[PDB]
Amino acid sequence: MTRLPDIKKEVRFNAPIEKVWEAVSTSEGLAFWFMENDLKAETGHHFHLQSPFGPSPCQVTDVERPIKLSFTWDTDGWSVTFHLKEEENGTIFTIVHSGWKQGDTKVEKAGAESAVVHERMDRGWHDLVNERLRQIVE
């Protein structure tokens, strides 16, 4: 249309949303799959991220029970939102990573094109919230 597509994925794991939540509410639980951090599932909080690419600040925007969760990462403009919801089969986890520009503008931060990175990131993003996370509950 007039922009790049967002990176929204969804997965289903067998476990109590409580565990998953706690796994996506704490830092250790997060870093367990995501990355090292000092998150405490608290809105208006201030926590940094110890990534390999380099240290970057992070700040929670929304966090209340296993229903809505969001946190900022980097300065460029990369934000991801999490959505949890307990179901019959088990727990439902939906990820949403947005923060791209028109399909042409190259990323000065990362390096490779936005689309390229999008696919790359998405890939790992999915794989991340595919098994890497499931293992946190499995």
What can you tell me about this protein's structure?
Pfam families: AHSA1. InterPro entries: ASHA1/2-like_C, START-like_dom_sf. Residues 14-138 form the Activator of Hsp90 ATPase homologue 1/2-like C-terminal domain. This is BH1534 protein. It comes from Halalkalibacterium halodurans (strain ATCC BAA-125 / DSM 18197 / FERM 7344 / JCM 9153 / C-125). With 138 residues, the protein is an alpha+beta fold. The chain has a single domain, classed as Alpha-D-Glucose-1,6-Bisphosphate, Chain A, domain 4 (2-Layer Sandwich), CATH 3.30.530. 25% of the residues lie in helices and 33% in strands. Strands 1-6-5-4-3-2 form a 6-stranded antiparallel beta sheet. A hairpin with a 4-residue loop joins β5 and β6. The longest helix is centred in the C-terminal third of the chain and has 19 residues, at 114-132. The chain is globular, with a radius of gyration of 15 Å.
Record the SSE blueprint:
Layout: E1 7-13, H1 17-23, H2 27-31, E2 46-50, E3 55-64, E4 68-73, E5 78-86, E6 91-98, H3 114-132, H4 134-137
Antiparallel strand pairs: 1-6, 2-3, 3-4, 4-5, 5-6
